[PDB]
Structure formats: C-alpha cells, structure tokens
Ligand binder design. Structure first.
Ligand SMILES: Nc1ncnc2c1ncn2[C@@H]1O[C@H](COP(=O)(O)OP(=O)(O)OP(=O)(O)O)[C@@H](O)[C@H]1O
Ligand SMILES: [Mg+2]
Lengths: 310, 430, 376
C-alpha cells in the first residue's frame, strides 16, 4: 500500500512548439516537498539533449535511439536542422525534475519561420529571451552548454535575459559546460585563462557562478593545488565520444568520457535546493507556480519595451 | 645519381657537402616541395657518405643558427617526417666521434628547453650535468619548449630501439635517472613530457626482455631490472598520476609480473627489496575509482600469487574481503578468484584488517555528525518496501540515492562509495 | 607579414602590377594556431606566418608576388587572442566603466570592419563551427547604413587620386564578394549536402533581412548565383602538434581551399569582374584592376581618415544601455513619490531597487538619494 505512483519511460512536452502551455505532467507528480529543478541552454549543435539524457536516466554505453530526450539524427545533420522543439519535461525516480530547451538563435528555426513584428528576425530573439527568463525564474539550476570556448555573444544574451526577467531577489546558479573538449583544453595553463576570462566577463552578473561545483576538488587534476587558480568558477568540461606493449591505446590527455559524465551527474544531484517564492512549495504547487509564471511572462510589459527598441 | 652507386668508394665529398650546405642555408621561405627535396638530398648524402663525414658537418647542423632546427615547425606532416628521417640517418652512423657531438648537442637542447620550462614555472633549473655551451643563453616559449622536448625524445628512438653505441650518458640512465625532475612538478603542468619519457623507456626495455637474463653488455646491464622495479614501485605509490600514465604503468607492471614467473630460474629475484616495493605499489594502487585499473592490478596480483611473504598475502586478504561486495560484476569475480587462490592458513588467521577498520571509521564519523534531515519519505518507503517485502521498485540505485541525498551548500571517501556495505549501512541509519 | 600602418608609409620591384585584395575576418577560438594564419599558409603554400610566435584591433597585410595577391587579416575583440589580453589588462588596470570599455571596443571593431569593406576585392568570414550565428545578419544591417552616412566624407579625401572615375563615385573598386568558411568540429557525399543546405539557409536569411538585394550596387556585398561560396574545412591532425608528435612516436616505436579561392580569383585577375543580378533587369557593375602604387595611393588616404567619430557615435550594447536608462528613469518616479529620515530613505531605496534595475542604476540611485536628502 506504498508502491510508487508510476515510472516515466519517455519525456513529455511541457510547452508546445507554438509557445502554448501543456498541462499533462500532473499525472506523474506527488505532494512531496524539496524538489530540484534543472534546466539547460545552448546553441544548435552543442548537445543539450544528449547531456540531459545522460544525466537523467541514461548511460553512455546505451544507444542514442532509446534516449529519454530525442537527439539529432544523422539524416538531420546533413540538412542543418534542429531536433528539439519547445520545452520538454522528465522526472527521475529521485524526484528530480529535468527541463530541456530548444536552441536559441538557431538558423533552423529562422529558416522554418521564413516560409510562414516588422521582420521575422526579432521573433526568434524574443523567444530565446522568454525561455531564458522562464528558466531563470522557475528552475533551481541552469546549465549552459557551449560548443566552442568564448562565443563572446552568450554572455551579453544572458545578461540581457536576466535584465528583462519577470521578477530579496532570487538568482539561480549558473553552470558553464564546455562540450566536445580536446586535449589542449585540459591543461592548467589554459584552465587559468578560461577561469580568468569567465570571471572578468561576468563581474556584475548577480548570478551564483562561483563557490559551487568546483571540478578541481573532483579529482580531475591530481596534483593541481587550489591556490593555483585566482577564482575557480563553476566550469566543467565534457570530452568527445570515446606482447602487451603493442596493444597500448592512444594517448588522449583527458579523462574518460564515462568518468567525467558520472562525476558531473553526481555533482549536479548533490547540489543545493534553495526556496523559490516566499513560501514552501510541493511538486504540484511548483507546477502551478511555473504555469502562472509562464502565463505572466507571455503577456509581460518589459518584453514590449524591449520590442519597440528593435 | 648518387644513389645509383654504392658507399664503397672515395668520391669527392667536399663539393657535395658545400652544395648541400649552400642550398640549406637559403631554404627558409621556400615552397612545400623544395624543402622536402632539400631534406631528402641531405638524408641521401649522409647515408651515402658513411664514416667519412667530418665532425664540422654535423657540428654546424645541430646549432641554433642552423636552419634545419627551424624547418621542423612546418604544419605539413611530410616536412616533419623528412626532418625525423634526417635525424635518424645522422644518429644511425657507425662513427662514434662524429655521433658523440650530435648526441651532446641534442641533449643540450633538451636541457635548455627543460630549464626554460622550469624557469617559466617559477622553479630552479636542473640537469646541469648534460648542459652544452652552444645553448648557454637562449629563450624557448612554453609551446616551443614542449615541442622541442617531444621531438628530441622521439628522435632518440633511433638509438634507443637499436638491435645491437657506447656513449657516456646511457639512454636507459638518461630516461631513468637524468630526467627525474619531470615526475616531481612537471608531471602536473606538462604531463605529455612525462608520458613520452615513460613510453620511450618502456619501448626500449620491452625489446630486451626487461633485462632479466643479465640479472661486456651483460656485465654493463647487471643492475637494470632492480632499477626498473624500483622506478615502477615509486611511480605507482604516488597519488598525483594521470589516467594515461597510470594505465601505461599498470600495463608495464602486468607484463613484468607475467614475465617474472614464466621460468623457474627467476626464483631468487623474489628476495630483493625492489620486488617488495613493487608489490607494495601494486597493492596500494588498487581500490581506486577506475575499474579497469583495479582489474589489471587484481590480474597482476593473481598471476604471481605464490612466492609472497605473509604480510603481502595478509593485505591481499583484506583487499579481497572489502572488494567482495562491489556494485560491479567483473570486480567481484576477479577478487573472488584471487581470494580463492590464497591458502587457508592466511584467510583464517586472526590478524587485523585495515580496510574494515577504515570502513568502520568512516561510518562512525558519519554517524557522529549532526542530522541532515534530507531523507525524503519516498526513499524511506522504498527502503522499507525492499526490506519487509523485497520489492524496491527501483531499477546501482544506492549510489544514486546517496548522491541525491547530499548538499553542496552545507564526507565519506569517494573510493568507498562503490561498496554496497557502506551504502546499505548509510541507508539504514538515515 | 607586416602591419598595415607600417606598410602604407613605405615597392620599385612591383611598382605597377595587377593585384587582387583579399580580406580575412571572423571569430577564432582559443588555440595556439589561429585559423587565419593557417589559411594564409595553406593558400600561399609557404610558411608565411612562422609557428610559435589602449586599443585591441589590428590589421596585417601580406603581399604574394608568386600569385600577385594582397591579403588583409583583421584581428579584434572577437578573436580570443585579443580578448584574453583585454581581460588580463582589465583584471589589474565599476558597472559603468566596463560598459563604456566594451562599447568603445565594439565601435573600434565596427570601424575597422567598415574600412575593410571598402578597400577589398574579395573578403571571407571564418567560423569555428558548422552553424553560423544569425547575429551577423544584424551586424551587417547596422554596417551598411553606417557607410551611407560616411560615404560623402570618404569620397572627399580620395578626390585627388588616380584610382579612376567609378572608384571616386562608389568609394570602392567593385562590389566585394563575401565567402563563408566553417569547420567540421567533429560533426558527421554528406559534405556536399551540408554545404548546399548551408548556402540555401544563408541566402534565404540574408534575402529576408533585406541585406542582399537584386541590384549589385546599393548592397555592400553579394554572393555567387551559380558557383560555390561556402567551404567546410575537414578535421586533420595538423592542429595540436603535440598529438601529431606523439602519434609519430607511437608509429616509430612499433574541391580544395586553394581551388575554392582561385575559382573566384581568376575572374578578377582576368578583368572580367563580377555579375550578380537576377532582378529581371540586370545592370552593368563597376569594376577596376589597380596596381600596387595605384591601390596604395587610395588606401593611405582612406586609412588616414574629423567627422568620422561623430558619425560612428550615433550607431550592440546601445540597446541594452537605452533599456537600462529607461528602466531606471521609470523606477525613479515611483520612489520619488514614496517619501528619522533614515527609515524613509531606506524604504524608498528598497522600493526603487525592487521596482527596476539595469546597467546604469547607480546614477539613478544617487540622484534619488540626493533629491530625497535635499527635501528635508
Ligand atoms: N560530446 C559529444 N561527443 C560526440 N558527439 C556528440 C557529443 N555531444 C553531442 N554529440 C552529437 O552531436 C549532435 C548534437 O545534437 P544533440 O542531439 O546532442 O543535441 P543538440 O545539439 O542540443 O540539439 P538541438 O539541435 O535540438 O539543439 C548529436 O548527433 C550527438 O550525437
Ligand atoms: Mg536537442
């Protein structure tokens, strides 16, 4: 008489591709408290869907055709199109909510909207800003996935999104995930430059991008002392897919993909869960709060002010 | 035309040498094909003129002012390949007096690059016993120094992998005792140099059966196995090793262990102290987060199970006991077989187990801490359902639950998080 | 390989030779070997740039006699090499100073880009990933209008030049052709399909944003209508020399970019020019083939250039600054109508902070505090 409610096999659609709410996740929610919400953000081919799938209910040794979050297929890469649309939803058995996100400012959505405001160009930017603000106001942590280092345009977008957010202020933690890392990026000399650039580029961001999720203490660098870094921000690197002398494998210079994925998952799960509103909330209450926030963000006033400026 | 004949004459070499030098001195900003042609011509000239090349030819060929050193920086792989071929041809000479100067110049360049890296890392210089006057004052960038060191190490394989060269600094001693500073601090910021040094040393030692028969040439190599074992033990006992370096060291250790017992004539080699240090390193390198490393260590220990003292067997018993309960499957079977390979006179002994003591200490430390109040009702319901009814309703779930029950805003060792005993005790207490 | 400023000041061997100007620009990731240097070395087939070798903008020039072509490489804050130095300098030596610093850097980069867009024959944009950022569409939209406000001033300085007639009118030799270069970055014949899809997407996006028009005169740049203008550099072991050396050690212990560029260079070198107009009524496009001294005569005058700063200051962080200023101004009236006096001042400040915030809230907060203090 204490069996679990149900087990989710595949992620559902929390928000339709037309920016419409979809109330269909209450069937898998309970009345428990102390819930954790994780969101993702990134460009078109960064790999947010794969990261979310591997961090929620998947393993690297499994296949990409059975992932909880649909990933880009080989036939789709040749056409230069996107796969994830709208916002997804999935909750693991540990009562951890995972939220996916479509690419921001991606040319695929723009091209699809061409054959369908003053011009059909600021619409994509506003949709991206709306999603960023929503994830920044109803999620406990947000992970930013970057295909390459220093895009120089994501920081400005993040600051602008946080400046136009809906609303003793609450600022969720920010995580910088560098996907498809190489050996050259796994050196202390380059690490210092990376941390310095990240810290100097977000000096007045008001977000919690430091003091938590320190990969230096996760045994990634055995002999690297903590004082070697002026300010270790929350940055993590994810590498590319992976008689006796002649059988020695090649030298990669970076830890195994599975090891880093497991470490990242453990660190994400062992994170804090601060309060969102000025009251305690449960799973159902959190769902209702998120729905109300999305409804308010859609018919907001700051967005119109920013729209007349473009 | 030169290759048509054979190196068994006394043809005029001054004209050919001056022609090659003149073409090399003005081949910096040339095309991609002219450089390759010049390098090929130089290699052919060196090979054709054997034991007759004056020392001045190679003296002015391996100096900073020489353009050859600046031609290896090309992005094309063909240029680097021909440059390496030139180095191989020069180092493949049978004339000791003309080869000693080249070897000394190469060693001096390596020392200069190492000193530059040490200075840039805010550390004093070293390796002053192989320094050269030609590189007294020079500046090498971090990337340039690393590239030069790796290139020289790769070029040394010509003489290191020889099939039988009587030089003062032996290759084995140079890579095992002279370059001992790369494992102190350079192994943290520049692990590529350490990996390259270990790889070349392993490649040179594996071609001579790790110098087991010896333990002129035989008398000179009468103390090589002991040094290899000591180096392996010291390196394995460290705690600041990289994944690639650890994997290479484990492979080398496994190969050496399998070779120690191939014959029965190597029995006296089990009493020397280096063997004890090697065994200690193997025992201390297990019980890590990596699964493949643990499997390799277990296989190596199971290979030479016999010939070990009571202390090593006693420690192995505790290691097998703690590893018997693991979240994996291969680890459990491997350690089970290893334990079954130990006699009853040691498994049933009343000696104290260190691993069990550490587990108990960790549990006590966690219990003495203040309550966390993070155990959700669902976790308790699942635990109760699995204990009273047997159905857990959860598809390695203990580790996931433990990780989800922690907080970063507000300390069991990570290596002990893979054991089901600790996780079960923690869940029951929670 | 010398600086552009150090080249115009200073030729007899190639005083009059027909050449083509090729501009190189775009973003670059943090790596030892930059994409532009490798591109120049591969095209010239020689080690032009040797390996291991106030403002944050730079323009490098290099002449190739074997091919009679001039290359103009551009470096700005977009590249990681300059960004790292800027961050390091800013670390040692306020929310208002950083904004102004970034705005100045962006303005300088925009000015340099505009200068390159008027003295080059063919220009190419690089990128570290297959996907192209749509932000460029806005940058170009904010650049064309800028030249429209600077063109009358540029033609006044080059009036006494032997460039010709069309050059003095359009302030350019001929409509420059833009090329796009991307990198595989581990993605994925599929290459041909990907290139075609990218070209179609780029053409549609640029046409919708009105960046590209039927007339090849008003637009600042055009693209080929029947040839290829998008290239994807495949992965190779050239990068990270350490890895290549390790692979070599392990082994010992046990179209094309050139053609892609000549396809377009042969047209300008043959005086044929370019013709891209399918608006049902094409018109002739101006084109010229100057020499070394002839090109320098105008390049020096254009590089030496009173009113440029004033015109460039009217054009991006401008939107963010305007939004922040508007929000602060709107929030100030609410707090000004809310007010011993310490409690009232604290309440007003808290209300103002919770009402709105931006990048210039310090000025509004100070003004409100001063007004409240002076009202008692
Ligand atoms: N670290 C990685 N190493 C190798 N391949 C990867 C890696 N991450 C992602 N990929 C592959 O590259 C592509 C990235 O797309 P993916 O499905 O992961 O999500 P995405 O790029 O966020 O998608 P979307 O276009 O919806 O934003 C996929 O084909 C995936 O298999
Ligand atoms: Mg996706």
């Amino acid at each position: 008489k204490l069996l679990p409610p149900e087990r989710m096999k595949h992620s559902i659609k929390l928000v339709d591709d037309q920016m419409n709410w979809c109330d269909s996740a209450i069937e898998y929610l309970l009345d428990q408290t102390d819930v954790l919400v994780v969101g993702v953000l990134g460009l078109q081919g960064t790999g947010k869907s794969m990261v979310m799938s591997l961090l929620s209910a998947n393993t690297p040794e499994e296949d990409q055709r059975t992932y909880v979050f649909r990933a880009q297929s080989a036939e789709m890469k040749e056409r230069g199109g996107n796969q994830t649309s709208g916002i997804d939803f999935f909750i693991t058995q540990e009562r951890i909510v995972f939220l996916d996100t479509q690419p921001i400012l991606s040319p695929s959505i723009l091209d699809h909207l061409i054959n369908n405001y003053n011009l059909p160009h600021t619409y994509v930017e506003m949709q991206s800003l709306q999603i960023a603000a929503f994830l920044f106001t109803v999620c406990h942590v947000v992970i930013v996935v970057q295909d390459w280092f220093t895009d120089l345009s994501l920081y400005r977008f993040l600051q602008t999104a946080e400046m136009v957010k809906p609303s003793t202020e609450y600022y969720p933690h920010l995580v910088f995930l560098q996907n498809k890392a190489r050996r050259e990026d796994f050196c202390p000399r380059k690490l210092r430059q990376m941390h310095l650039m990240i810290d100097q580029l977000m000096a007045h961001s008001h977000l919690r991008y430091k003091g938590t999720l320190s990969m230096l203490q996760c045994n990634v660098f055995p002999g690297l002392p903590p004082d070697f870094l002026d300010s270790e921000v929350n940055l993590f690197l994810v590498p590319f897919m992976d008689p006796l002398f002649s059988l020695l494998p090649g030298y990669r210079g970076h830890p195994s993909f599975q090891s880093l994925v497991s470490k990242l998952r453990s660190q994400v799960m062992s994170m804090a869960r601060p309060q969102l509103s000025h009251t305690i909330l449960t799973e159902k209450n959190w769902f209702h709060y998120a729905a109300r926030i999305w409804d308010g963000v859609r018919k907001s006033s700051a967005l119109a002010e920013y729209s007349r400026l473009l | 035309l030169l290759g048509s004949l054979d190196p068994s004459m006394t043809i005029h070499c001054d004209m050919v040498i001056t022609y090659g030098l003149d073409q090399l001195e003005n081949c910096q900003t040339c095309g991609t094909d002219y450089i390759i042609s010049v390098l090929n011509l130089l290699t052919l000239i060196v090979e054709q003129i054997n034991t007759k090349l004056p020392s001045s030819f190679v003296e002015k060929l391996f100096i900073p002012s020489s353009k050859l050193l600046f031609l290896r920086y090309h992005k094309e792989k063909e240029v680097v390949a021909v440059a390496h071929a030139v180095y191989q041809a020069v180092l493949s000479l049978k004339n000791i007096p003309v080869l000693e100067t080249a070897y000394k110049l190469i060693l001096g360049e390596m020392t200069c690059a190492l000193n530059n890296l040490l200075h840039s890392l805010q550390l004093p210089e070293a390796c002053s016993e192989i320094k050269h006057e030609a590189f007294k004052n020079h500046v090498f960038n971090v990337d340039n120094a690393k590239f030069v060191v790796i290139f020289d190490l790769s070029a040394l394989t010509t003489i290191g992998n020889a099939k039988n060269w009587a030089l003062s600094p032996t290759v084995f001693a140079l890579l095992s005792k002279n370059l001992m500073i790369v494992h102190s601090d350079l192994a943290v910021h520049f692990p590529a140099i350490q990996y390259a040094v270990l790889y070349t040393l392993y490649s040179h030692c594996t071609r001579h059966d790790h110098f087991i028969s010896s333990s002129t040439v035989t008398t000179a190599t009468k103390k090589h196995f002991s040094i290899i074992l000591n180096l392996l033990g010291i390196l394995l006992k460290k705690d600041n090793l990289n994944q690639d370096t650890r994997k290479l060291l484990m492979t080398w250790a496994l190969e050496a262990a399998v070779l120690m017992r191939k014959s029965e004539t190597y029995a006296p080699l089990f009493s020397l102290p280096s063997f004890h240090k090697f065994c200690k390193g193997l025992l201390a390198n297990t019980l890590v987060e990596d699964v493949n490393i643990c499997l390799q260590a277990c296989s190596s220990l199971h290979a030479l199970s016999s010939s070990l003292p009571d202390d090593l067997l006693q420690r192995c018993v505790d290691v097998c006991r703690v590893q018997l309960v693991h979240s994996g499957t291969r680890i459990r079977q491997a350690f089970g077989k290893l334990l079954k390979s130990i006699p009853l006179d040691v498994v049933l002994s009343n000696n104290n187990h260190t691993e069990i003591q550490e587990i108990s200490l960790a549990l006590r430390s966690h219990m003495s801490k203040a309550p966390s109040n993070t155990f959700h009702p669902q976790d308790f319901s699942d635990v109760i359902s699995f204990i009273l009814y047997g159905n857990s309703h959860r598809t390695n779930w203990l580790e996931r639950l433990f990780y989800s029950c922690q907080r970063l805003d507000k300390t069991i060792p990570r290596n002990l998080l893979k054991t089901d005993a600790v996780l079960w005790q923690w869940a029951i207490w929670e | 390989p010398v600086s552009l400023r150090d080249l115009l000041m200073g030729e007899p061997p190639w005083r009059e030779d027909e050449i083509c100007v090729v501009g190189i620009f775009g973003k670059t990731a943090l790596r030892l070997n930059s994409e532009k240097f490798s591109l120049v070395n591969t095209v010239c087939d020689r080690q032009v740039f040797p390996l291991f070798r106030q403002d944050y903008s730079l323009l490098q020039a290099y002449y190739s006699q074997e091919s009679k072509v001039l290359y103009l490489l551009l470096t700005s804050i977009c590249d990681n090499s300059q960004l790292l130095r800027a961050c390091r300098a800013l670390q040692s030596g306020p929310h208002a100073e950083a904004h102004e610093f970034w705005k100045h850097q962006e303005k300088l980069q925009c000015l340099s880009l505009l200068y390159l867009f008027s003295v080059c024959h063919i220009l190419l944009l690089v990128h570290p990933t297959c996907s192209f950022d749509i932000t460029y569409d806005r940058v170009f939209r904010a650049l064309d209008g800028l030249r429209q406000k600077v063109l009358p001033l540029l033609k006044t300085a080059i009036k006494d030049c032997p460039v010709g007639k069309d050059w003095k009118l359009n302030c350019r030799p001929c409509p420059p052709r833009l090329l796009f270069l991307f990198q595989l970055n581990g993605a994925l014949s599929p290459k041909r399909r990907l290139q075609h899809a990218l070209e179609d997407q780029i053409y549609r996006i640029f046409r919708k944003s009105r960046v590209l028009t039927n007339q090849s005169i008003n637009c600042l740049f055009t693209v080929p209508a029947n040839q290829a203008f998008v290239y994807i550099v495949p992965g190779s072991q050239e990068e990270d020399p350490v890895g290549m050396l390790l692979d070599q050690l392990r082994s010992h212990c046990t179209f094309t970019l050139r053609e892609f560029l000549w396809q377009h260079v042969e047209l300008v070198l043959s005086k044929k020019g370019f013709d891209d107009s399918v608006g049902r009524n094409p018109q002739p496009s101006h084109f010229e083939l100057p020499t070394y001294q002839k090109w320098i005569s105008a390049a020096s005058k254009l590089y030496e250039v009173s009113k440029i700063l004033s015109s460039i200051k009217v054009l991006f962080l401008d939107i963010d600054t305007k939004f922040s200023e508007n929000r602060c101004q709107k929030a100030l009236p609410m707090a000004h109508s809310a007010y011993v006096h310490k409690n009232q001042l604290a309440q007003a400040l808290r209300v103002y902070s919770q009402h709105a915030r931006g990048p210039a809230f310090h000025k509004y907060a100070m003004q409100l505090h001063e007004d409240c203090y002076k009202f008692w």
